[model samples]
Target: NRLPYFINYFFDTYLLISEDTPVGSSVTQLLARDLDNDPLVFGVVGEEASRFFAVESETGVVWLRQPLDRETKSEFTVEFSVSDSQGVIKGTVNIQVGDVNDNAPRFHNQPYSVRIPENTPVGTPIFIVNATDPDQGAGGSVLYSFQPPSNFFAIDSGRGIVTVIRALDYEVTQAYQLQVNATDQDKTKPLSTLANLAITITD
Candidate 1:
C-alpha cells in the first residue's frame, strides 16, 4: 500500500479489481489473479455451485458469483467482499481446469470423405478423423492440427492421422477439400476442435 494502486491510493479500496473473467468453456486461465490483492480470490472450489472469487478489490472492474453457462459449466464463481479506505476481507480462488483425452483421440466430424483412385500414390493413408475431450492423464491434454489445402495432404497430429502427400488425379483433382483443426495449447484455447475432409478423385 505504498501508493501504486494503478498509480496511487486508488481510493484505498472500495473493492475495485476487474479483468473481465468470462472466456469460453467457462474460462480456465487466471480468470482471477491478484487484481492488486487487497482481497482478490479464486479459492472456494466446487460443490453445489461453489468456486467463488471477488475483487471489488480497489482498482477496476470484475464481478461474478454466478451467471455463466459455458456449455453448462466448468468453472467461474466469484463472490464478493472487500471494502477499503480502511477495512474488510474475504477472497476466493478456483480458476479454470478443463481438458481431457486420455491417449489423445479427438474429432467428431467436419469433412472426411475420400474416393481418390486416379492413381493414388503419394503417401496414401487417408481416412481418419477424431475429436473428443475427457481430460485425461493430467487433466486431458490435446494438440492436433491439419490444414491441408495445397501441399496435397499430410496429417498426423498423433492419430487423427491421415496421409497423402500428393499424387492423384481424376484428370486433375476431382474434389478434395481438406481443412482440419484441433488445438489446445491449454492456456484457455481449451480444445478448439475442427475436422474436415472431402476427396473424390475416382475413375
Candidate 2:
C-alpha cells in the first residue's frame, strides 16, 4: 500500500513498466481498507471512478502491461475474495499454454485384415489406408507411409493411397497373407498400425 494508485475505472490507471505502460505496470487500486465494510466506497469511488475491487480473469485478453521477449505459459496464483483483509489468500490458476500438440497421425482401426483372389492381374487397385490426426489447423496436415514386407503391395506417398504395384501369380503360391501397416510421415511421433491381408491363388 506504499505506492499510490488512481482509481481510474475506464483506464484501470496504474504505473506501467514500459515507456507507455510496460509489463507489470497495470496497477489496480488496492483499497487497503475493505470497500464492502464501508458505505460510500460500496460502488465506484466517483462518478467516473472504477469499482473498488474489480478483479477479472486475465485469460486470452492482451494488454500493453509488460513486454515479454518470448511467448510463455504463465501460471496465475489463486484469486482472493475481497474481505476484511485478514491476509492475502493466494490462489492458483491453470493456464492453457500455447503449445501445438504436433503429434503424428495414427490409425484408429487395427488388425485390418482383407482378402483378394490370386486370379487378379498385376497393378490391381487395393485398399487405401488412412490415419487419424488429433490436432487442429496445420497440426492436422499429416502424411502417410508404408511399413511392409515389400513383397506384397506398394503405397502411394503423395496421396496416402494404396494399390497393387506388382502382379501376384496365386497359381504358384496359392495363398499369401501380407502385413499391411499405416504410419505418419512427420517427425512428431512414429505412429503405425498393423493389419493383414491375404491373396489366394485358385485354379
Candidate 3:
C-alpha cells in the first residue's frame, strides 16, 4: 500500500490575493501524487476555509467562494487534505488578503454649529474636526482641507484643526458655512467626503 504525498508544492505555501477579487476566481492549485497510482480526492479541512474558499476535488484548484474584506480579516490559514486508499496527507496554505481603497474618510460630527465671539483674535483655534478611515496603510491616511477655499478660516491639513485667519464681524456676516473635506491618500483611487461647519459670530 502507498500513501498520498505532495509533489512540487510551494516552498512558502503562501498566496497574496486582493480583497476586491470576485467570487469564483481561482486562487491557487495544489499538486499531490500517490505511488500506487490510486485516485486521490482533495478537500479543505476547516470551517472557515469551507466558508471562504472551495477546493476542486479532482483538480485540486482552490476557488474564492466569498467576498474578502481586509479590514475585517487580513490573513487566513487554509488546511488541505489529500486522501487515497492508503493514507491521507495534510498541507497548509496561508492566504494573505491585500488592502483595497473601499472605505472613505468619515467625519465624527456632522453639520457642526458653534458660536464664537466677534472679537475673537485672529489665528485663534476655532474647531477641531476629526475623521476616520477603516482601510490600512495609505488608504487610511486622511488629509483635511476646505472645499471652496475659505478666506475667513484656515484648516490644518494634517491635524484637522481649524483656525480663524480673518477678523469676524457679527454685523457684516452673521453666520458662515464652511465646507470641510477629508480625503484618503490612496494612490490608485483616492476617496473623499465633506462636512459642513456653521459658525455664528456673536456680538
Candidate 4:
C-alpha cells in the first residue's frame, strides 16, 4: 500500500500499558503500513504526557522516552492520532502505574520519654511507639521493634506498644535507654528509622 492508511487502526479501544516501560523500549507499534509503503504519520495530542514517549515517523513505533514511576502518577490517558492525506484516526492509550519499594518508614512523634513506677507489675504497659510509611501495600506497612535487648522491656511487634517483660525496680536501675527502629518488610532494600527512648523508674 503506497498510500498510508488514512485512518489509524487500533484493535483495542484503549491501549493499556504498565508504567516502568524501559527507556528506549517500544511500548506499542502504531498501526501504519509504511514510509514509502504508505505509513501513517503519528503524533501525540498532549505535551504533558508526550515527554515520556517518542514516535518513529517512518514506522509509527511508539518508544518509551524515559523511566516511569507509578507512585508519582498512577495512570495516564494519552491521546494520539495517525494521519494521511486520505484521513486521520485518533486513539487513547492508558498507562497503569505499579507500586515499588521507594519509601521509608517514619516515626511520627518527637523524641519519646516516659516514666513508670519501679514497683509496676511485670506486664505493665509503658510507651506506645508509632511509625508510618507513605508507599502503598506492603511497602507502606511498618513494623515496630526495640534494640539492645533488655530483660525488663519488650515491644509488641504488631501494636507498637512497649511493655514490661519482667518486674522492674528503681532500687536496682534508675533509668533505662532503648533504641527503637521502624522497619519496612522489604528485605532486599529495607527502609528504616531509629529513635532513642528513655524510660525512668520512679519510686
Candidate 5:
C-alpha cells in the first residue's frame, strides 16, 4: 500500500495571527509529497477547523474563513489532511491568536450612590470604583481618573479607591456629583468609560 508523505513538514507547525486579521486572509501554507507522484488534495480534518479555516485543495494554502476574537478564543489546534490515490496523511497546526486593542474599559456597579456622616474624617476611604478590560497584556491594563475634577474627593490612579480629600459639610453642600473615568493603558488608541458618583452627607 502506497501512503502519501509530507515534505518540509516542520515549518508552520506553530503560527501566530492577529485577532483583527480580516476574513479570507492567508494564514499559512502546507506542502506534501507522494512517492507515487499522485496529485494531492489538501483539506481541514474537523468540523470546527472547517468553520474557521479552509485549505486550497490543489495549492495547500490555508486561509481564514471567519473573524477571530482573542478575548473569546486565544488559541486553536487544527488537523489537516493530505490525500493521494493510495492513502491520506494528517498533520497538526497550532495557531495563537494575538491580542488587539478592540475593547474598552468597562465600569462595574455603575450609578454609584453613597451616604456618609458629616463627621467622617478626612482621608477616609468612602467608595471604590472597579473597571475591567478583556484585552490581553498592556491593552487590558486600566487606570482611573476624575472628570471635571473633584475637590472633596480623590481617586487612586491605579487602585480605583476613592478617598475624602476635603472636608464635607452637611449645612453647606448636602450632596456632590462626581464623575469617575476609567481608561485603558493602550498607547496608540486608549479607550475610556465614565461612571457617575452621587455622594450625600448627613448629620
Candidate 6:
C-alpha cells in the first residue's frame, strides 16, 4: 500500500500578474503538508514551465525567475509534486500573465491618401484611417487626431474617419499635406506615432 495523501492546498489554485513583473516576483506558495507527519520534499515535475519559475525545495515557495511576456505565452502550467519517506503526492499550479502596454500602435496603411472633387461640401467623409495595437485594454485602444491644425479637414476620434470640416477649393490649394497621430492610453506609459495623410482636390 502507498500513502500519498495531502489535501487542501489552495482551492482556487489560480494566480495572475501583469507581464514584465520584475524578476523574483512571487507567483504563489505551495502548501502541501504530509498528512502522516512525514517531511515533504517539494519539486517541479517538468521542465517546460519550470524554467521561468524558481521553486523552493524546503519552503515550497515559488517565484518568477524571469520576466513573462503575455504576447509570447499567456498562461503557464507548473506541475508540482511532493515526496515523503513513504510516497509522493501529485498536484499542479497555474500561473496567468496579464498583458502590458509594451507595443505601440501601428498604422495599417502608411502614406494614407485621399481624393475629393473640388468644392466638396463640408462634413463629407473622405477616408478612414486604421491602426492596430497588439496589446490589450487601454494599450490597444487607439485614438486618432490631426498633427497640425486643420481648418478644412478633421478626423473622427472614435472611428478614424477623415472628413472635411470646411469646403475644399482647388483654386487656392489643389493638394493638402496633413499628418495624423495615433495614440494609446497606457496608464502611466502612453504610446504615440504619426502617419501621413494626403488629400488631392480634383477639378
Please give each candidate's TM-score.
0.29, 0.43, 0.91, 0.78, 0.89, 0.86
| Top TM-score prediction, candidate number | 3
Name the lDDT value of residue 131 in candidate 5: 93
State the lDDT of candidate 3 residue by residue for 53-167, as single tens digits: 8889999898999999998899988888899956788887788898899999988876588899999999999899999999998989999999999989999999999999988
TM-score-wise, the better of 1 and 6 is 6
Q: Which has the higher lDDT value, candidate number 1 or candidate number 2? A: 1
- Give, for candidate 5, the lowest lDDT window spanning 10 residues: 5-14
For lDDT, the strongest prediction is 3
lDDT of 4 at 108: 64
lDDT digits (tens) for residues 1-203 of candidate 5: 57776665444556789998999999777888787788999889899889999999999998999999998999988888999956788987788898999999988887698999988889999998999999977789999988988888999999998999887888899998988888888889998888898999989
lDDT by residue (1-203, candidate 4, tens digit) is: 24443234433445545554568988877765535654357876688668977888656788888787766777778777677756666667666666677778777676899989988888888789888887777767788888766788988877889999888877789999898888888756778888888998899
lDDT of 6 by residue, 1-203 (tens): 34544354442566677897888987666776554667777777777867887779877787877778898899877777778866777676577888889988899866688888987788788899998888988888999999886999889987899988877678899899888888997888989988998898899
Residue pairs with clashing backbones, model 5: none
Model 5 residue 134 lDDT score = 96
Worst 10 residues of 2 by lDDT: 39-48
- Model 5: lDDT equals 0.87
Return the TM-score for candidate 3, rounded to 2 decimals.
0.91
Instruction: Give me the runs in candidate 2 sitting further than 4 Å from their true place.
Output: 1-104, 108-110, 136-141, 149-152, 158-160, 188-190, 201-203
Better of 4 and 5 by lDDT: 5
Candidate 6 CA-lDDT value: 0.80
> TM-score of predicted model 4?
0.78
Predicted candidate 2 versus true structure: per-residue lDDT over 76-123, tens digit per residue = 222222222233322222222232433456664454544667656667
Quantify all predictions' global Cα lDDT against the true fold: 0.49, 0.41, 0.88, 0.75, 0.87, 0.80
After the best TM-score superposition of candidate 5, give how far the Cα of residue 22 lies from its true spot, in angstroms.
Answer: 1.0
Stretches of model 5 off by over 4 angstroms after superposition? 1-13, 33-39
The full ranking of all candidates by lDDT, starting with the best, is 3, 5, 6, 4, 1, 2
- Candidate 2 lDDT score relative to the true structure: 0.41
**TM-score computed on alpha carbons, candidate 5:** 0.89
